[PDB]
Design a protein around this nucleic acid. Structure first.
Lengths: 48, 605
RNA sequence: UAACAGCCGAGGUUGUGAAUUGCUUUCAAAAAUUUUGAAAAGCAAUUCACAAUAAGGAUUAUUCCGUUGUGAAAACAUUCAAGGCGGGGCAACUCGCCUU
């Protein structure tokens, strides 16, 4: 009668967006690791 | 605005002098602060305003008069996201230190203070950008590796081995740019939303695909900000204008607007403005408010091709140029430059390039065009192809030309002025277009006549539609597109209705067409589904002889609550329902150990 | 008014390490069954750093799929052509125009 996120697709999109943000953060971290390793800035055990 | 103050401060009210605003039997006061500020809105209850520390986010705007127009808005500490954001912003700002340094200092003062989620939750990304740049440019001196080039090529190659272009582009930057603008703070632009734009209903293209067939691609809708569409709408409004007077309320039109010169003058006058209204339209004819009107709302304004006027205003503000730089090509190119490039820095680059290519000074043109408002998200019904085809027909005077018309419309006009018979010409055409005796009479045309002249179809008459069996209904169900309604509930209800009618036809018709004779629909927020379901179900029991024609079949007879309840009470169905539902009621009586759930009546005994 | 879809933010939770201090038990000693002590474990509190955040499956593009709908094909819908008249930035990419 009023409507407040009254749809299954809405919550599906919400979950998808959250997952997408998480994956973007993980990709950024991966690229940072690769750059720091090729520059040799990380500690030995961490890079191991 | 250059200020964007939005400053969060906590102020205590000193006194509340009575402002003498007696509304609904209560006199309102004002608000005075120590700094010398007053709340713009009035105050009624004094219990929550006397000598209390009230905090607001205030924005100061410099008006043309020369004084700040301070705004006030109630905010609550640690409860409002914007309030917390602004408080942390100001706390970092007046320290004149980096946000990490601010967190440090807070840790120095109180080791027990929690940082994340409480001290600094939300701030602008620019603060982190500033601190991180500062630390990288500081460390770049000490570490020679941050100034090397072999490692900077190696890391670029690692990141973009399969991208030669991005490798070559980035080979010109430093490590600071990689860490800031390519890895950490890179944020992807919005995905293009043009894929959902509606299709033109007039222009089609036919092509042979890889599947050994020949099918049609549609044309995307023209943006409503297109100068062609703006001109088309302005021409439509100017031609549709009919005037009325105030004394005898007669149709004074066709007297002050009879020749082509008056319409040409009206168009040229409306080009120089952005929005026509009552006063401007009346003054254009030297008329007055007290004596005449324009058949429409006396206090409403309509679009008047504001893009051209805005472009002219900006190209006059740049100055140091003649009054001949702006033309139709320049207007279209400006529209393309602004609307196509939806990114700030790339918009700046495009504006600078546009100023460079033309022999104009890029001193104030860039400043005028950098604050150009992004165009509103709206698209027309048709495309630019249809408007380009149709526009020559509508214009009158020097803007009316027979040369720009394409082959098809010209041939159709020649056929309709010749009076010969074509398979695409009906008696309706000769009835409507009997006044088009000469090719010059095609002046000041309207949308419907010009549309039929161009394409050959009179408006939208639909295709009626008849389903010969459940095969058509199941094909339509299979081809039904999801999320094609207002909400999922209605679309799923309609889909299940279609499923059940398919099943019942298959069972009780046994593959025999026209088994159903009438279908009645009852609904009982949900009102919009009636027309759609009637249109869908019309395709079954429609009568093709012509005695049943229109948007909906006459066979579909909607119901209402009145007839339902009347027939249920009169035909004994209410009694049937009551006796059918009784057993739960005497069980309820038994479990309740009371007789209140069933009441005896003597009128029915 | 609403659908659909996209770019991002701050928490919270479980888990690892760490700073401080707790409750219970046992090793574990002294003292008058009881008090105190070294150590270990179990369970936590406050703060910081890090991991995971639907189970899982790809990939190395600055890419993703995983809570929607149809229905037996474990198959799909939610991407879907060819060129040309071109503009936009250091370009990738994107936005206007035309014929099959």
């Amino acid at each position: 009668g009023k409507g407040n996120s009254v749809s299954q697709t809405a919550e599906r999109t919400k979950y998808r967006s959250v997952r997408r943000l998480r994956e973007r953060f993980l990709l950024r971290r991966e690229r940072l690791h690769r750059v720091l390793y090729i520059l040799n800035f990380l500690p030995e055990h961490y890079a191991s | 605005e250059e200020e964007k103050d939005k400053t969060f401060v906590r102020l205590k009210v000193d006194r509340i002098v009575d402002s003498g605003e007696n509304v609904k039997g209560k006199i309102l006061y004002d608000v005075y602060f120590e700094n010398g500020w007053k709340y713009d809105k009035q105050v009624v209850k004094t219990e929550d305003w006397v000598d209390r520390t009230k905090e607001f986010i205030v924005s100061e705007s410099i008006l043309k008069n020369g004084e700040t127009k301070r705004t006030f808005k109630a905010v609550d500490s640690e409860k409002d996201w914007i309030a917390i954001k602004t408080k942390t912003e100001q706390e970092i700002e007046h320290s004149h230190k980096t946000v990490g340094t601010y967190i440090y200092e807070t840790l120095l003062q109180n080791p027990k203070q929690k940082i994340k989620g409480k001290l600094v939750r939300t701030i602008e990304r620019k603060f982190y950008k500033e601190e991180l740049r500062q630390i990288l440019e500081k460390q770049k001196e000490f570490h020679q590796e941050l100034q090397s080039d072999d490692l900077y090529n190696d890391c670029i190659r690692e990141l973009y081995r399969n991208n030669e272009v991005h490798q070559l582009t980035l080979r010109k930057k430093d490590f600071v740019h990689l860490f800031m603008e390519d890895i950490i703070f890179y944020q992807r632009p919005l995905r293009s939303q043009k894929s959902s734009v509606s299709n033109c209903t007039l222009e089609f293209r036919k092509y042979k695909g890889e599947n050994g067939a020949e099918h049609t691609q549609y044309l995307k809708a023209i943006p409503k900000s297109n100068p062609y569409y703006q001109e088309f709408r302005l021409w439509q409004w100017i031609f549709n204008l009919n005037l009325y007077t105030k004394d005898n309320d007669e149709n004074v039109t066709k007297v002050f607007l009879n020749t082509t010169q008056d319409f040409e003058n009206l168009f040229e006058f409306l080009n120089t403005r952005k929005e026509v209204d009552q006063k401007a339209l009346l003054k254009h004819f030297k008329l007055n408010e007290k004596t005449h009107r324009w058949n429409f709302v006396e206090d409403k304004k309509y679009p008047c091709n504001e893009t051209k006027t805005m472009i002219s205003s900006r190209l006059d503000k740049v100055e140091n140029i003649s009054d001949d730089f702006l033309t139709r090509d320049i207007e279209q190119k400006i529209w393309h430059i602004i609307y196509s490039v939806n990114d700030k820095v790339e918009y700046e680059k495009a504006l600078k390039s546009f100023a460079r290519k033309h022999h104009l000074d890029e001193s104030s043109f860039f400043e005028a065009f950098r604050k150009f408002p992004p165009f509103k998200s709206e698209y027309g019904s048709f495309s630019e192809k249809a408007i380009k085809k149709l526009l020559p027909l509508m214009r009158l005077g020097k803007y009316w030309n027979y040369a720009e018309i394409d082959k098809y419309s010209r041939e159709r006009i020649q056929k309709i002025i010749t009076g010969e018979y074509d398979e695409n010409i009906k008696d309706k055409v000769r009835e409507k277009s009997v006044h088009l005796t000469i090719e010059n009479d095609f002046q000041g045309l309207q949308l419907w006549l010009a549309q039929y002249i161009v394409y050959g179809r009179h408006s939208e008459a639909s295709m009626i539609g008849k389903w010969n069996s459940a095969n058509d209904l199941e094909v339509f169900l299979k081809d039904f597109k999801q999320h094609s309604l207002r909400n999922p509930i209605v679309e799923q209800v309609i889909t299940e209705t279609l499923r059940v009618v398919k099943d019942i036809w298959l069972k009780y018709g046994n593959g025999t067409k026209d088994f159903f004779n009438e279908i009645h629909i009852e609904l009982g927020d949900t009102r919009y589904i009636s027309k759609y379901i009637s249109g869908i179900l019309s395709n079954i029991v429609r009568v093709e002889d012509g005695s049943d024609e229109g948007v909906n079949s006459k066979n579909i007879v909607p119901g209402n609550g009145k007839i339902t309840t009347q027939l249920k009470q009169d035909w004994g169905l209410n009694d049937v329902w009551n006796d059918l539902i009784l057993p739960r009621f005497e069980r309820m009586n038994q479990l309740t150990n009371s007789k209140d759930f069933t009441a005896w009546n003597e009128n029915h005994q």
